[PDB]
């Protein structure tokens, strides 16, 4: 059911995360971990401590789609271990050293084509799907963009309602 999926979502912030590759998306996937540019860092760490829950909901430039979404379960922490992300033109390794922790949520996929009915008011009511790495998404908007997504009945939402 969607009960405690709910129940996670209710007074959560919502962040678009913008990833140049998959590869980098299936590495977050299987470890649990997210690293961003040092100002989504400094967004997200100030976000982490105000809201009961922080989503982020992921997407692969280029793929017409968001490949899931997940609430981070902790702020960035250095040194850790090195991360083997694949680094785009012009990132280098040390703009990723901060990392997040996160519980996946949802690891399927939603295409554009099914979110192109909600616009975000943080983003000049554009399209949800349109937006930066690091963009926020309004509560309503990012409630219901999460809830559009396939069930993920791989996933036991009551560990991370204890995180909470
Ligand atoms: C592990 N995290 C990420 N992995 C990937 Cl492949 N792209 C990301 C990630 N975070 C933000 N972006 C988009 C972006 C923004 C700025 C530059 C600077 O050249 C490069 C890429």
Redesign the pocket.
């Known amino acids: 059911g969607t009960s405690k999926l709910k129940y996670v979502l209710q007074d959560a912030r919502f962040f678009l995360?913008?990833?140049?590759?998959h590869?980098?998306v299936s590495l977050?996937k299987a470890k649990g971990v997210?690293?961003?540019?040092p100002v989504?860092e400094k967004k997200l760490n100030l976000a982490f401590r105000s809201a009961r829950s922080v989503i982020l909901i992921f997407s692969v430039?280029e793929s017409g789609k968001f490949q899931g979404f997940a609430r981070l379960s902790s702020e960035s922490h250095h040194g850790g271990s090195p991360?083997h992300?694949?680094?785009?033109?012009?990132?280098s390794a040390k703009?990723?050293g901060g990392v997040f922790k996160i519980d996946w949520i949802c690891r399927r996929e939603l295409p554009f084509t099914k979110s192109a009915h909600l616009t975000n008011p943080w983003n000049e009511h554009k399209p949800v799907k349109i937006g930066r790495?690091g963009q926020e998404i309004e509560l309503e908007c990012g409630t219901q963009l999460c809830l559009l997504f396939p069930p993920d009945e791989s996933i036991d939402l009551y560990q991370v309602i204890h995180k909470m």
């Not at 992300?85 to 990132?91: F, N, R, S």
């Open positions: 995360i913008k990833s140049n590759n590869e980098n977050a997210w690293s961003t540019l989504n430039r991360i992300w694949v680094l785009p033109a012009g990132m703009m990723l790495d």
